[PDB]
Scaffold this active site. Structure first.
Site: not given
Ligand SMILES: C[C@H](Nc1nc2c(cnn2C2CCCC2)c(=O)[nH]1)c1ccc(Cl)cc1
Ligand SMILES: C[C@H](Nc1nc2c(cnn2C2CCCC2)c(=O)[nH]1)c1ccc(Cl)cc1
Ligand SMILES: [Mg+2]
Ligand SMILES: [Mg+2]
Ligand SMILES: [Zn+2]
Ligand SMILES: [Zn+2]
Lengths: 326, 322
Positions: B68, B70-72, B218, B240, B268
């Site tokens: 989470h 800036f690149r996301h 997102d 996570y 995942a």
């Protein structure tokens, strides 16, 4: 001898159960002991193992986080909780509700206006206050009330829930949030509609039905001033107008939209109350009376008397106005 | 280096874009270009320098989490940009709706701490208390977004009339709040109900389409080419697992799905791709059939590759158990 003021006479203890209680007779410490008594009396101290000293400290800390606004102050908080207490006895709520639910109602009532700044949500949103920004225009005041309440309860010395298992805390927390957020009057009609929908076939074992009933109960208590005896109810109207005129003056001064019903040039004590009583208070209590018929005699009766009285007072105000030009 | 090449400009329109090539300044220029290219600078009189300052300020407020970050934020904005072209959204949406979509995408994870809502609530954090357990992270991202816009030097909306501001603000709030995955099924049910008879002139229908659109962007990493998608999975787990370690360590509940002892890259993604991503893009495809080939295709290929990888993981684990 005679005992200090913060030890309640048995007469006071008897009167505290009724909605006729004169909330003006008491000072903060006395009101605090009243609230304290309420928690012992309702069996909450016993059933949730509340440390009695923590209870006292929590109440003092709650008191400290109410502000000296003309209306939204500690005494209001007291009225709301005292009315909730009155309705517990009037409607025999301990027969319908778990003790956890009574705790949710009472605690929510005491906490529902914490750190109210004296300017409503419309002001927060229109003036783009820190609160509106923080809560993204979504019931900013009520979210804040609820956050302060749980900040308080996270201080270990104020935490009346310290001996409750985490499953109970979670259930109580979510209960209080729902109820405190339900006092945002922007949501009045929505909630009343949802409640009336369930009232077609009300079901005391249905959890959604009960959530709404609790939302309605706290809402009733929140705005129940006019239910109280005329002598007790009237000064609250001066307090209301004083606080609300303070807001509209400021809105005028900062160039923000001004609502006619709060304009100090346009409002009388009578026009403030009539519509509110006839179309907000009466319908709400009428619906509650279907579940609790005893409410008609004790709470609709004085609302009717107050409607009639303020309606007459308006006829007189209008005739007097006419006369200065007629 | 500072300046984007025409090839980069051209590639920016497609979901094939290699988000890893670029360092923060070049991503900021790409985001800048999007606002000019979409006509948002023109149609809202955004001061061009304020736009640059605003992007830098947004950048400053994203944190260096593994996922989470800036690149996301860039991936989400750039995937939105790609969908505006792919689905020809300027025919269906006003320019105000596009601005809401793009700005919400950029702002939707501002100041993310790196531990999700479940952590916030169970740990009884400052944010969970402040927002009363109601989408605390997403309310906070939103709040931060408008604190940023209240700073006059960062205010790209400074030349929009009050009413337009209010409309943009409301739209942005709805979309950023819609990114909370706890609401995934609710929002999908609502949208599928409207897709029974969809109406581009019904505002409630459009509000849900935009909610779905931002949600798509997102969580869209797996739609990108494998070389671009794979590294995001390492980031995802790094972040996570950091949480679930802390949860074990503090006595808080831990979810099997993000337990460092139980989770492979393959386990995942398989479920997530199959039951969250594919069905969501399937529904969108009914409105925009061109989506199938550009976005459902790489998803099908990804699902199949992870299912293969799982079979091979399960085989190497048969050489271990005692
Ligand atoms: C319509 C309203 N009247 C009114 N409003 C009341 C009462 C109690 N609470 N409240 C409001 C304050 C927040 C829950 C609604 C009440 O007894 N009367 C009102 C009229 C004039 C002014 Cl200036 C302000 C309010
Ligand atoms: C089920 C979930 N998978 C997953 N989750 C993803 C992706 C993208 N965003 N997200 C989530 C991040 C918060 C919005 C959903 C993705 O590509 N895969 C997941 C599994 C294991 C771990 Cl450790 C973490 C997440
Ligand atoms: Mg209130
Ligand atoms: Mg997010
Ligand atoms: Zn109140
Ligand atoms: Zn995100």
């Amino acid at each position: 001898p005679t005992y200090p003021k913060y030890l309640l006479s048995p007469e006071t203890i008897e009167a505290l159960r009724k909605p006729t209680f004169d909330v003006w007779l008491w000072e903060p410490n006395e009101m605090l002991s009243c609230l304290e008594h309420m928690y012992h009396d309702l069996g909450l101290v016993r059933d949730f193992s509340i440390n009695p000293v923590t209870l006292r400290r929590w109440l003092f800390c709650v008191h400290d986080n109410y502000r000296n606004n003309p209306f939204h102050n500690f005494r209001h908080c007291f009225c709301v909780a005292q009315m909730m207490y009155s309705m517990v006895w009037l409607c025999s709520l301990q027969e319908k509700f778990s003790q956890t639910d009574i705790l949710i109602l009472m605690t929510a009532a005491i906490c529902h206006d914490l750190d109210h700044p004296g300017y409503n949500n419309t002001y927060q949103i229109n003036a783009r206050t820190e609160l509106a920004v923080r809560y993204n225009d979504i019931s900013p005041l009520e979210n804040h009330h609820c956050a302060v309440a749980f900040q308080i309860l996270a201080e270990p010395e104020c935490n009346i829930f310290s001996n409750i298992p985490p499953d109970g805390f979670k259930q109580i927390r979510q209960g209080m949030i729902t109820l405190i957020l339900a006092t945002d009057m922007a949501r009045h009609a929505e909630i009343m509609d949802s409640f009336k929908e369930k009232m077609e076939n009300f079901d005391y074992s249905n959890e959604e039905h009960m959530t709404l009933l609790k939302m309605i109960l706290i809402k009733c208590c929140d705005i129940s001033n006019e239910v109280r005896p005329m002598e007790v109810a009237e000064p609250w109207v001066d307090c209301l107008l004083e606080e609300y005129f303070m807001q509209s003056d400021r809105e005028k001064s900062e160039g923000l939209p001004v609502a006619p019903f709060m304009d100090r040039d346009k409002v009388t004590k009578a026009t403030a109350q009539i519509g509110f009583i006839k179309f907000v208070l009466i319908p709400m209590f009428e619906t509650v009376t279907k579940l609790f018929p005893m409410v008609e005699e004790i709470m609709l009766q004085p609302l009717w008397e107050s409607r009639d009285r303020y309606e007459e007072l308006k006829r007189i105000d209008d005739a007097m106005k006419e006369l200065q030009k007629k």
